[model samples]
Target chain A: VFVDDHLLEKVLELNAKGEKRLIKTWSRRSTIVPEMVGHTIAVYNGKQHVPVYITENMVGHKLGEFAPTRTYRGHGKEAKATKKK
Target chain B: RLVEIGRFGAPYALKGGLRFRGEPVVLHLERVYVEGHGWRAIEDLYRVGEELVVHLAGVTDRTLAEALVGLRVYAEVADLPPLEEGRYYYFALIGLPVYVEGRQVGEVVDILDAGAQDVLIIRGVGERLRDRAERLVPLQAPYVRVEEGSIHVDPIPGLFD
Candidate 1:
């Protein structure tokens, strides 16, 4: 239920104005609500911003759930060594 | 296949030396294919600290070197040096199938240089046009396993969703 105050305010403003546009935010911890549906939010994914489309199903989920913070490198050489034994 | 190794910068001096912007591999090449100018034999090449100055046959003056400015340089695959076992050139990895948990998910359409590491652009194979999606997977040891014919990825939840 935790949502950033600035993000909530921006969403409310957009909804009131009936303006549909991309909302860029670094607040990945913000929770998506019903008002966020039909809007696009660009969530910061560590290196760059990733655009996430909000839908009914996304409600009650944290924005970070859709934006991954870490880039995957494969399992290290150590893992391969252990498997050989 | 011809692989792009670097690009030509502005002419260095009146002696027809063209600035080379690429890796040290350029030093090992005897000749290079220049876009629009064809293949030219290397005359002399030396590194000036971090920069490389190259002299090509027939390019004997600054005007000749200026004509090659901004042109791309390439080398044939066979002419390039070989890599250690299990290592692959980025170009060879293109178009390879990508799998997850033994299930095929997509194929590598392109590879990008992301500063610290390379990133593979995977285009998903879907039943419908709208179902297809593109994913960027980093080519690092902890996330990908390169096999003989395919690439295996350790998937994270929501990566394809």
Candidate 2:
């Protein structure tokens, strides 16, 4: 899978040092590797930074997949129209 | 609504007095609603050092008082004294939605008395933004602002995380 080179370097740095600090990144395109399993990453969700705790199951997935950029407004316009009528 | 005020502790004296474990607001209450036993009139209430000793009607002996041990005590909202502006009861704040920077964070499910101030236990509604599903937020000034029937937080970084 494609992993951002800069983000990989930061993840490697955190892994080598074994620091507990959160790795703040705006790169939602970065792929989560095995090294990030126990670490927490703060991914920017347009307005605020959402904290995501990496688990083994989350490996190989994109960082942006966990942090939602948009809020869900629900579906079905027919229900709204019927309620008004 | 009937708010839980306290629970009945061990029998205080031989004359049907019960030990109460709750706030001093119970002292002002003329009557209390006992679970299973229904409403009972407060015959006498006095403070024994820091503990509150109460006498309820019909509980005239130690044998009768023993029956109420561990039973929850409740007080009606109407019986409670009105608070000044900005002040709120724990029952009033519970179940209110908590918001941060206009975005909904979670809902206040429970409140804890942390000696100095009350702590609000927030249960996240959607999306796991943080590691923990439940977050404990202090109910103090600057960080928390109670207005418009909902709790407004300042969205301090790492506070939610």
Candidate 3:
């Protein structure tokens, strides 16, 4: 088993950014500045999230909208093994 | 029945005011005391008498009443229009996964009401690094870069843990 410091750094960065990209590269320890103006639906495909279009009429006039104070994650954790490892 | 007023438009004039553009909508208040959180209904009720009235006990002065006239009110959960022509709901964005350039971050736990801005709350990650706790990521297209499979998030400055 080798300790991957670079891998660890990447995880921390994505964790901070609250998301990961697919261009085959990820920045480290990035800050989160997510902007949702007209996004109405969030979709998950086993490993990632997909976006659908939205309109003003759908959200009405957004003002101090209430989202979570936590990071941006998808659907949920997949049910894992439970045989007491 | 149960209305939840979560927002109010800024009133007009110099006395702590802002305008709501359309007909000033105030959330039904009786829904709060009765249904407990009836403060969220703000829409076409179409009737003065049918509209619920709310006022603080003891502070029933005429000046206060005049000051609050035409003030838009809201409930916690307002019924809005359905998605139309490339429009999605923010509530639908909850629980979407986060990935950075392909690397998974975690799952979305909640969304933040960042006041004039929306933040995506993310959680759930592979066993590595500290993936606990919800991370606050600003909902920016560039920062997010991709939104397929799980939502992919690229790093900016001061975004992640």
Candidate 4:
């Protein structure tokens, strides 16, 4: 939901320095880059922090792509409001 | 004597110290072992948020501390303080069968941390069912009914969807 291009850069910096291995972020909208591979980071998926271990196929996608924010209501064409008499 | 409790997190201080990222249920931590490195006791320790930052024995430099990142920390199960009734160790819940209204749902595989609370990964018939594979039940009392050797779950509609 937030924008921070520098976030990816910061993650890479931590990987190189080893000063930071646990990456916690609420920037679900941020895209995953190649450099993020192999790091275990917790991304806020609206409700809770979901741990994601980035892989090769994950690149070019937003971080939020993995964590879902919605819930399945039920099976139906649509559940509409009804009139209460 | 060693039961896995947590793991080394981000470096907190530059002076050879690292933080942990798990429940602070640990007390009197004796020795910690990483992959390549063997067991090392704590030189100094303190709590940070729900985690801990410790000066591990033999690891006293920024380089040494940094290298210890991502290492799992174990504690003596004997040192664990007593827990009040209705409270149970997360590890204890593992392998326990889960049910829904007397119908076996699955078995506990892994406990997931879902921000506000923990979530349980239920591995059951859903795997063969494909679409119904793997139920993720929240570790809440209202949803989970813990019993002897088993847990009864009342799953919400469309949980797998």
Query: Using lDDT as the measure, what is the rank order of every candidate, best first?
Result: 1, 2, 4, 3
Candidate 4 lDDT tens digits, A1-85: 3336666767778778775354667888887777787554557777655555566776787777655543632111011111110
lDDT of 1 by residue, A1-85 (tens): 7888888888899899887555778998889988898666657778655556566877998887766644643211111111100
lDDT of 4 by residue, B64-129 (tens): 888878877665565566556665566667788888888776788766543333556777755564
Model 2: residues with Cα > 4 Å off, grouped in runs: A1-85, B128-131
Task: Give each model a TM-score.
Answer: 0.61, 0.61, 0.35, 0.50
Clashing pairs in 1: A73-B142, A73-B143, A74-B140, A74-B141, A74-B142, A74-B143, A75-B142
Error of 2 at A66 (Å): 34
- Top DockQ model: 3
lDDT of 3 by residue, A5-50 (tens): 4534544565577754321112212222223222222223233232
Q: Considering the two chains of model 1, state its CAPRI-style docking category.
A: incorrect
Q: What is the C-alpha local distance difference test score of each model?
A: 0.72, 0.71, 0.37, 0.62
Between candidates 1 and 2, which one is better according to lDDT?
Answer: 1
Ranking by TM-score: 2, 1, 4, 3
| iRMS, all models | 13.2, 18.8, 16.3, 19.8
TM-score of 2: 0.61
Chain A TM-score compared with the true chain A, each model in order: 0.78, 0.74, 0.23, 0.67
Model 2 Cα lDDT, one tens digit per residue, A1-85:
6777776787788778776455677888888889887665666769645556566877988887766643532211111110000
Better lDDT candidate (2, 3): 2
What would the DockQ be for model 4? Answer: 0.02
